[PDB]
Symmetry: D2
Subunit: 422 residues, 4 copies
C-alpha cells in the first residue's frame, strides 16, 4: 500500500518517459504540501474571520500590494493578519507561522522612488518579513532597496521582481545580491512578447534552483476564479507546471485580493501543488542538483547533502533541523528531498521567512529552556517529533534524519543523526 | 561553415546542455525560432469561423485541421461548413508557397451503454462527405472503438479514429483503448468534471507519454486560450498551458469556443502558432531522443529501422529536413515518433494521407499530382526533387544544405528501407 | 568548471592536478580515460590490501619486518605444504615482526594471519586433514580462513562447524576454483564472509580464455553485496626470478583494482622467489596508481542506485558519510567500530577518503584489512568513566594519529562516524569536523 | 528465440548499469560473432616457413610485422616473399580468401634527434617492396611523423603510418602526434623502461581512449602472452592483459617473441583469437555507443553522416553485418569508429586497402577480383552479393538475417551516402 501512494511507481522509473507513463490519478498524495502559497490581501480577504479561513486553507505568506491603499489601510491589514494568526497560538504543536510581505509600487517612469522609500520605512516600522521589490532592472536597484530598509531592516528578505527585458538580461547580477526572485508575469507579459514568458519563467526557476535561492511564480495562475467557483483547465495546468518547473512559491493576486472566491482559490492551489509535488521525478532531479551544487568546505553545506542522501536511502518521513536564521533548512531544501524539512526555531521572524523555501515546515519553539545546552537541543528535536506526529508528518516506526550543530549560535551545523520514531 | 549566428538561434545553446537543469538555465528569450511550426493546430468551426473569408484568414494564421462538433448543428449545417473549408483551402491552389492541405475531423456527440443512433448516422455522414478523422467522444473501452470502426463501414476504413478520453474509466482502460485506436485526445473539459480538477494534469502527462512511447498521435484539448473568447490577449496561465502541452509531447493542440464562437478566432490561432514555435525550439532533444530510442523495442521492420537511422543521421549533420516518400503516411509517422528537430517533408500522391499526417508532429505534407513516369526510379527522383524545390520555395532549404531522404526499394506501401544523405544543389 | 571553481581557488590548482582529479571530474567514462595523466601523482594512502604468502623466502623475522614496511597487510599460510610445526613457527615469526613496531600507533601496523586449506582433493566435502588444520587455526588464533575448492553452501557450513564454538569470529573467505563454484556462486557468497578468485585452479577447471569473465562477474557481485573479494595467482609471476615484472603483470594488478578487488595476492612471488620485498613494493606502487584512476563519479552513482533502500541506521549513516566526504574532498572518514562492520559499510561505497577505523579489538583491527580503504588503529587505553568522554577520546586519537601520519593536515575536513550507545550495531551519527 | 538472447553475453548487454552488466557476465554464454580485434604477429625464425605461415593465417593472423631492428634487407625480402606465397595459396577460393597486411617496424632514432640514416634506407626498402603499414619507432613529436612520410617519397603516399609511443615525450606530445599519424601503437616494452612500470597502464588506457575518440586505430603491444615463448599455456595475468586490452578499446593486439622466436607461434595466435572473441562479447555497447555518439562532433561529411545512421540502424534490428563498399577503406573506418556489434564486411577491389583495413576493429575485408560490369548499378550489386556469399560461407550470415548495406551515389572514393536495410535470402 505504501509503494502505491504518492506516485511511488512513477518515482521508481528508469527514464523520465517511463515516469510519465506510470503517473496514476488513483495514487493519492501523502506528504504535506511543500510549495508555499502567497495570497494578496485586499477587500475580499481583509477581515479577521476571512483570514482565519485562508490560514486553514493553506495561506503561508500574506502579500500587501503597496500600489494601492494608504499606510493606514495596510497597517490595519497587518493587524488583522496577526490577529488571525495568533488566534491559533493556544495549540503549540500545531501553530502555523504566516509571513507578511510588502510589494512595492515601483520606480514608475524614474531608480528608487520617493514613495518606495516611505513605504519601505513603513515596512521596517511594522516588522514585515519580506519585500517584493517591483521592476528590479540591475544590482544597484537591490542595493537601493537594502539601504532604504536601514540598520533596523537588516533581517528582511529582498525578493526581486523580474518584470521586463532588462531584468531578464541582467538576471545573474540581480540574483547574486537578492535573497530570491519573483517571476512577475503580469508586467513581463506586456514588456516582452506573451509567447516568450514561459522561457523566462523556466530559465529563472532553473537558475534559482541552481543557486539554492527561493523563486516565486506569480500572476493570473487561477485568474478565472476572480468571478467563477472553479478554474479553467489551463489554470490548473499552470499551477502544476510551476511546481514541476521547480518554483518554491506560487501566488494569488486578484483571486484573493478582490475576487468572489478567495478561500476556494487558496484551496485549489493547495490541492494542485500536493498532486504536482508527488509527480516530481526525484531520481533525476536529485542527481542533477547534487552534481551541479559546487564542492564545498562549509560544514552546513556538507552536512546538508549528507542528510538529504541519507533521507532518500531510508525513505525518511522527515529531516528535523535546528535553525536560528533558517539557513540550515534552506541548504537542505536546495536538494529537493521528498522528506519534509521540519525546521525548529526560536526566531518568530525566521519561522515566517522559511516559507520561501520549498518543503520547509517551520515550528516556532516556545517551551521552557533547559539548563544544559545538550539537553535543550534534544528537547527541540523531541518537540519536532511531537509536532510532526500531531500534524501527520510522522508515525511510530518511521525513520527521521536529525540535523544539529556542535555549539550554540548560527553557523555551526555539522551533525546528522539517524533516529527511529518512538 | 554555419557560423556563430546559427548556433545562437532556435535555443541551440540550451539544446547542447549536458543536463536538463543546465538546459533550463540556458533558455534565452532573445534566441529566435527558425524552424517551421511542427505542432498542428486544430480549430473548431462555428458561427465565428464558418465564412469562406474567415476560413482563409484562419488557414493563413496556421489552422491545419478543421474540427466539426456534431454535438450541435444539423447535417446540412456541417455539410456547408465542410464545403466552406474546402473552398477556402482550394483558393490557394494557384500559389505553391501558400497552398496547404487542411484535414477535416468529425467530433461525435457521444453515447447509453455504447454507440448511439445519432453517432451511427453522423459517422455515416462523415464517410459520405470524405472526412479524414473522427474524434470519438467518451471512449471508455476497446469495444467502443470497435463499434466506431464498424460504423465507418465498407468505404471508411482509411479514416483515422482518435479516441477522446473524458472520464475515469477511459483513463483506467487507456492501454486497451490506445492499442486499437489511431491516436488519443486528452478531452480536458469533461475529464475535469469526471475526475478531480487537480488531477487532470497527471492524466494529460501520462497519456501524452504513453502515446509518445507507442508512436501514435496525441491531441491536447479544451480551454487552452479560453479567455480569448472575449479578450484580444490570453492570460499568463493560458500561454503557459499551450507551451507545456508542446513540451509534454503533444502532437496537436486544439481550440474550441475560441474559434467556434469567440470574438477573436484568427488571433487565437495566431497565438497558438507563436507559442508552439517557441516551445518546439525549447524541447530538450538530447534526452528525449535518447529515451525514445531506449524505450522503443528492437525491430526487424525495415521502415522502423530506416526511420531511426534517418533521425540519427539528421541530428549528426543538423539536417534542414528529412524528405520521405509515403503513400499511407506510415513512413512519415515512424520518423515523427523519434521527434527529430529536422522537418519531415512527406511527399505523397494520396490527398487523404496528406491531410491525415497533420496528426503527427513535425510532418509537412506535400501533395504530388504529376502523372507517373514509366521508369519507376525516375518517378522516385522527380518526387524527391519536388520535395527539395518545395523546401527551397518555403524557406526550409538552401543550396549547400544537407537533407536526409527516405525511400523504399520497390513501389507500393510497406517497403521503406533506404536512407540517403543528399547535398542540396 | 563552476562545480569546482571555489574549491579550486581555496585548495589550489596543484591539488586538483594530483591523484587523477581531472579524470575524476569527467562527465563520461571515455573522457575519464582521455584525461588519465602519467604526471598526476597519487597522494592517498594505498587502499587495496596486499596478501603475501609466507614461505622460505619470507619466513625470517628480519625479512618479515621489511615486508611489513613494504606494505604486507595479510600473511597467508598455505596448508597444502609444510607441517603444523612449520606453520606455528611462521605464525610466531610474523607476530614477533608485527610486535616490533608496537611502541606507538604511529609505527604499529596490524597484520592479519590467514590459513589457506589444502582442500577436499578427490573427496565430496571436508577432508580429515582440513578438520585438523582448521582446529590448528583456532588454537593458534588465525584471523581468516581461505577455504579451498568451495563448490556449494554446505561446504562453507562444514568449515564453520570445524572451527568449533571458539572460532566463531574467524572470517571465512571461500575460494572459487571450478565450474561448480562459479555456477553456485550466489549461494556460496550468501553464507561466506567473502570470496577469493583462485585463478590458478580456475584456469585449469574452465577454459583459460574465460577466467577474466568469472573474475569480473565475482568481483561485481561481491561489490554489489558489500563483501570482500580477493584477486589471486600469477599476478606478478615473473618476479619469482626477475627484479621487474612483465607488461601483462603490471596491467593485471592495475585491472584487478579497477575491477573492484578489495585485496590482491602474492603466492610464489613472496613464498619462494628471489625478490619478495620488491614484489610487495610493486603491488603497492601499482595499486596506488590504479586506485587514483578509479572513476568514482559513475562507480558511486551505480553502487548507490543498485544498493536496495535500507532502514538499518549503520547503512544509512555510511552512505551519508561517503556523500559528505565527496562533497568536501575529505581527507579521511574516522569511524569507531567493535567488529569492523561500520567500517565495512563505509568501504562498500568506495569513498576516495581513507576510512580510519578506531577499535579496541585486536582481531577486528587485523580482519578489516579485507575491506578496501580501511586503515585500522588499535586503541589500547582503558575506558573513561563517562561513555561520551571515552567516545571523544577515541575520535581525538584517530585525529591525532591521522595528523602525525600525514593522512590529515590542519585545515582539512574529516567526517566522523559514531553511535548513540555502547556495543556493536548502533552506529547512527555523522559529523563534519575541521582539523585545527 | 530464447537461445539467441542467452549467447554472446546478451543478458549482460541488456543491463541498465555497468555494475549489473558485470554481475550478469556468464562463462557458459558462448561467443557467436566473428573475432573483431586484429592480431599482429611478428615474423621471425619460428614463423618464416611458408607452411607455418599458412597455419598462422588459418589461426587468425591478420597483419605480419617485420621487425627491422634485426636482420638484413635480404632477410626481410625473403620474409615478405614467404608471407605473400602463404597468403596467395588461398586465392583460388575467392569467397574465403583472407588478406594479410605487411607492416614494417623501424629500428628507430637511437641516440639521434630524429630520422636515422638506417631508417631512411629501410623506409625506401618498404616502398620498393610494397609494405602496407609502417610502425614508426620512438615517435616524440609531429615532425618525426613528417620525416617518416617524406622518406616514403611520392610512391609511398598510400602507406599507413602508425606512430609508436615509447617514452615520456611521446606521451606528453600525444595529441600533436595523433593529429598527423594514421594511428598509434602503445609500445609497452620501451614505455615500461622510459616511465615507471606502474604507470604504463595509465598511458595505455589514455592513448586507447584518445584514439577511440579520434576514430583512428590503436595497437596494444609487447609481453601480452610472453610466457608462451617457452610454455604451451599462458599465465593468468597474460590472459587478463589480452582481455583488458580489448575491453579498453584496442583495435589490434600484438605478438612479438611469441611468434618471432618462440616454440608456440600458432598456439599464441589461437590464444589471442580465443580471448579476443570472449572479451568482444563482454563489451558494454549500451554505454560505449552512447558515449562515442555523444563525443563525436557534428559533421557535414556524407560518409560520416551515413556511417552513424548505419550503426544506429544495425543496433535497432540486431543486424548480423554492415556490408560496405570501399575504395580506400575510409567508409569502413567511419563505421568501425562507432563500435557496432554487427561485423563490418568491407568489399574492395584495392588489394592494399583490403590489407590496411585490418587496423580498424570489426572490419572484415573481402578482396573482389572481377573486372567492372558495364552497368555501374549491376557492378555495385555484384559486390554486395559477393559480400553476402562470403559472409554465408564464413558463418557471418544466414538466411533470414538482416544486414545494413552502405554504398555511394557515383563511382570513385569519397561519395558514400546511402544506407539500405536488406533481408538475407
Ligand atoms: N531541474 C530539473 C531536473 C529534472 C527535471 S525532470 O522532471 O526529471 N525532467 C524534465 C523533462 N525532461 S525532458 O528531457 O525535457 C523530457 C521530456 C519528455 C520526455 O518524454 C522525455 O523523454 C524527456 C527530463 C527531465 C526537471 C527539472
Ligand atoms: N570508452 C568506453 C566507454 C564505456 C566503457 S564501459 O565498459 O561501459 N565502462 C567500464 C568502466 N566503468 S566504471 O565507471 O569504471 C565502473 C567500474 C566498475 C563498476 O562496478 C562500476 O559501477 C563502474 C564505466 C563503464 C568502456 C570504454
Ligand atoms: O541554520 P543556522 O542559522 O546556521 O542555525 C543553526 C544553529 O542551530 C543550532 O543547532 C542550535 O543553536 P542554538 O542553541 O543557539 O539555538 C546550532 O548548533 C547551529 O549552529
Ligand atoms: O509510408 P508507406 O505508405 O509505407 O509508403 C512508402 C513507400 O513509398 C515508396 O518510397 C515509393 O513508392 P511508390 O512509387 O509506390 O509511391 C516505396 O518504395 C515505399 O514502400
Ligand atoms: O561497527 P560496529 O561493530 O557495529 O561498532 C560500532 C559501535 O561502536 C560505537 O561507536 C562505540 O561503542 P563502544 O563504546 O562499545 O566501543 C557504538 O556507538 C557503535 O554501536
Ligand atoms: O570508402 P571510400 O574510399 O570513400 O569508397 C567509397 C566508394 O565506393 C563506392 O561505393 C563504389 O565505388 P566504385 O564503383 O568506384 O568501386 C562509391 O560509390 C563510394 O564513393
Ligand atoms: O507586479 C506583478 O506582480 C506583475 O506584474 O505580475
Ligand atoms: O469533448 C471535449 O473536447 C472535452 O470534453 O474537452
Ligand atoms: O589455490 C589457489 O590459490 C589457486 O588455484 O589460484
Ligand atoms: O618497440 C616495441 O614494440 C616496444 O618497445 O614495445
Ligand atoms: K505592487
Ligand atoms: K462533440
Ligand atoms: K592451499
Ligand atoms: K623495431
Ligand atoms: Mg508588476
Ligand atoms: Mg467532452
Ligand atoms: Mg587452488
Ligand atoms: Mg620499442
Amino acid at each position: 500500500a505504501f509503494f502505491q501512494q504518492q506516485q511511488l511507481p512513477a518515482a521508481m522509473a528508469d527514464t523520465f518517459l517511463e515516469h510519465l507513463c506510470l503517473l496514476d490519478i488513483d495514487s493519492e498524495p501523502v506528504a504535506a504540501r511543500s510549495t508555499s502559497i502567497i495570497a494578496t490581501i485586499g477587500p475580499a480577504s481583509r477581515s479577521v474571520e476571512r483570514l482565519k479561513e485562508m490560514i486553514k486553507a493553506g495561506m503561508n505568506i500574506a502579500r500587501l500590494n503597496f500600489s494601492h491603499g494608504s499606510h493606514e489601510y495596510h497597517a490595519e491589514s497587518i493587524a488583522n493578519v496577526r490577529e488571525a494568526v495568533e488566534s491559533f497560538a493556544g495549540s503549540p504543536l500545531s501553530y502555523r507561522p504566516v509571513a507578511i510581505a510588502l510589494d512595492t509600487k515601483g520606480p514608475g517612469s524614474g531608480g528608487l522612488s520617493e514613495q518606495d522609500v516611505r513605504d519601505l520605512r513603513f515596512g521596517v516600522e511594522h516588522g514585515v518579513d519580506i519585500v517584493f521589490a517591483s521592476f528590479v532592472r540591475k544590482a544597484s536597484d537591490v542595493a537601493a532597496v537594502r539601504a532604504a530598509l536601514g540598520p533596523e531592516g537588516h533581517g528582511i528578505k529582498i525578493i526581486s521582481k523580474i518584470e521586463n527585458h532588462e531584468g531578464v538580461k541582467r538576471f545573474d547580477e540581480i540574483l547574486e545580491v537578492s535573497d530570491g526572485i519573483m517571476v512577475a508575469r503580469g508586467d513581463l507579459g506586456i514588456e516582452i512578447p506573451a509567447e516568450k514568458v514561459f522561457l523566462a519563467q523556466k530559465m529563472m526557476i532553473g537558475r534559482c534552483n541552481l543557486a539554492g535561492k527561493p523563486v516565486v511564480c506569480a500572476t493570473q495562475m487561477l485568474e478565472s476564479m476572480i468571478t467563477k467557483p472553479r478554474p479553467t483547465r489551463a489554470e490548473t495546468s499552470d499551477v502544476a507546471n510551476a511546481v514541476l518547473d521547480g518554483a518554491d512559491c506560487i501566488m494569488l493576486s486578484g483571486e484573493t485580493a478582490k475576487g468572489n472566491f478567495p478561500v476556494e482559490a487558496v484551496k485549489m492551489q493547495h490541492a494542485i501543488a500536493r498532486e504536482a509535488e508527488a509527480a516530481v521525478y526525484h531520481r533525476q532531479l536529485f542527481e542533477e542538483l547534487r552534481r551541479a551544487a559546487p564542492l564545498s568546505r562549509d560544514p552546513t553545506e556538507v552536512t546538508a547533502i549528507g542528510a538529504v542522501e541519507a533521507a532518500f536511502k531510508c525513505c525518511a518521513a522527515a529531516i528535523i533541523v535546528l535553525t536560528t536564521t533558517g539557513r540550515s533548512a534552506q541548504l537542505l531544501s536546495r536538494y529537493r528531498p521528498r522528506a519534509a524539512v521540519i525546521a525548529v526555531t526560536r526566531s518568530a521572524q525566521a519561522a515566517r521567512q522559511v516559507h520561501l523555501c520549498r518543503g520547509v515546515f517551520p515550528l516556532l519553539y516556545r517551551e521552557p529552556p533547559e539548563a544544559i545546552w545538550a539537553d535543550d537541543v534534544d528537547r527541540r528535536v523531541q518537540f519536532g517529533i511531537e509536532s510532526g506526529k500531531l500534524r501527520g508528518f510522522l508515525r511510530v516506526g518511521d525513520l527521521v534524519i536529525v540535523v544539529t550543530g556542535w555549539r550554540p549560535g548560527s553557523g555551526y551545523t555539522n551533525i546528522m543523526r539517524v533516529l527511529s520514531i518512538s
